[PDB]
Design a protein that fits this description.
This protein is an alpha+beta fold. It has two domains: 121 residues, Phosphorylase Kinase, domain 1 (2-Layer Sandwich); 229 residues, Transferase(Phosphotransferase) domain 1 (Transferase(Phosphotransferase), domain 1, Orthogonal Bundle). Helices cover 32% and strands 13% of the residues. Helix 1 runs parallel beside helix 11 and helix 3 runs antiparallel to helix 5. The relative contact order is 0.13. The structure holds ligand FRZ. Belongs to the protein kinase superfamily. CMGC Ser/Thr protein kinase family. MAP kinase subfamily. Its cofactor is Mg(2+).
């Protein structure tokens, strides 16, 4: 005596364990809703995804699920359950379940003005979790405000590993103006110059952009298109020094920068008048042009601005490094569906 239940767009087949559905969001890659978790009496967040039609959609699903299930950390969202049909043939949509988190950084910065206390705390939690992911040789590659979940009690947890992958520094070099998929406003300068984003330094840059954005409730470098994003970065940072030209071997990247007029660095304090100086000093180190000089995660956690929370022994690392034997492109949608099936088998009764 009941029903399957539909939200707004379409049906949600997740009974009987979860009920009382409420629409939350939907942005291309699935619809997010809020359900009631019977058994473990607590509300939860559940996302319906129908990726099998598209290749791209299938990669995003596998990375997220394989990574999330493998990771175990307080500042990274975990997967409680995964619903889908008993066979590959009957599987069209997958439902992933996570603890319910009232909001995210993106939604919170639209109206609330974070105080220094809350900024410092949120930055710490961001870095604590990043230390764990980097320690497993993984790069999130798409850290942004909407990727950070927040409880009402301020516990912050990272969540979108759709474009995440295994480090791999040896193959980071690429040509000038190489296409990229991760969110524009958070891409480091080298992405547009000579990098594919295969090193840990790329997440740090994104984190710094999230620091700045927390400090003034608006994107630090809001580019409108590919090369405009680098124009925004260079606008504030100034012209890159000549003295240190670490990397940047391809002549096209070097020549482009070399053809810009000299532009001086806009001082941090000028952009953020009323803001702790220690926070600004870290911000500087996180947003340094040169990716080799850029500060790394553990080093960031040890910065004076974060001294109230810093404690190495309470900042766990992964028990074992992550291995992605699936390759970037190469892998048809069919096998991806199989891996997804296999990856999610543990949640089937048995
Ligand atoms: N845990 C959450 N509570 N409320 C939320 N709103 N959006 C998210 C969320 C999910 C998602 C939702 C349910 C299950 C699996 C993935 N995927 N995802 C991808 C990009 C940005 C946010 C986000 C997470 C939560």
């Amino acid at each position: 005596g009941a029903g399957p239940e539909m939200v707004r767009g379409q049906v949600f087949d997740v009974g009987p364990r979860y009920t009382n559905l409420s629409y939350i969001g939907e942005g291309a890659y699935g619809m997010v809703c809020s359900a009631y978790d019977n058994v473990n009496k607590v509300r939860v967040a559940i996302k319906k995804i129908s990726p099998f039609e598209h290749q791209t959609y299938c990669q995003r699903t596998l990375r997220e699920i394989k990574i999330l299930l493998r990771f175990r950390h307080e500042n990274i969202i975990g997967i409680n359950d995964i619903i889908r049909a008993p066979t590959i043939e009957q599987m069209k949509d997958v439902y992933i379940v996570q603890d319910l988190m009232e909001t995210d950084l993106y939604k919170l910065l639209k109206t609330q003005h974070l105080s220094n206390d809350h900024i410092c705390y949120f930055l710490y939690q961001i870095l604590r979790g990043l230390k764990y992911i980097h320690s497993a040789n993984v790069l999130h590659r798409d850290l942004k405000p909407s990727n950070l979940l927040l409880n009402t009690t301020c516990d912050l947890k990272i969540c979108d590993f759709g474009l995440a992958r295994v480090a791999d520094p040896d193959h980071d070099h690429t040509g000038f103006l190489t296409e990229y998929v991760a969110t524009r406003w958070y891409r480091a300068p080298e992405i547009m110059l000579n990098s594919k984003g295969y090193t840990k330094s790329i997440d740090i840059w994104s984190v710094g952009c999230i620091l700045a954005e927390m400090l003034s409730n608006r994107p630090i470098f809001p580019g409108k298109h590919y090369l405009d994003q680098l124009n925004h970065i260079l606008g504030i940072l100034g012209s890159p020094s000549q003295e240190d030209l670490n990397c940047i071997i391809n002549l096209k990247a070097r020549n482009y920068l070399l053809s810009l007029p000299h532009k001086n660095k806009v001082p941090w304090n000028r952009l953020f008048p009323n803001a702790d100086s220690k926070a600004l000093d870290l911000l500087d180190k996180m947003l340094t042009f040169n990716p080799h000089k850029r500060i790394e995660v553990e080093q960031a956690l040890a910065h004076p601005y974060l001294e109230q929370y810093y404690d190495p022994s309470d900042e766990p690392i992964a028990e074992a490094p992550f291995k992605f034997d699936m390759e970037l492109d190469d892998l048809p949608k069919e096998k991806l569906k199989e891996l997804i099936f296999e990856e999610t088998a543990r949640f089937q009764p048995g």
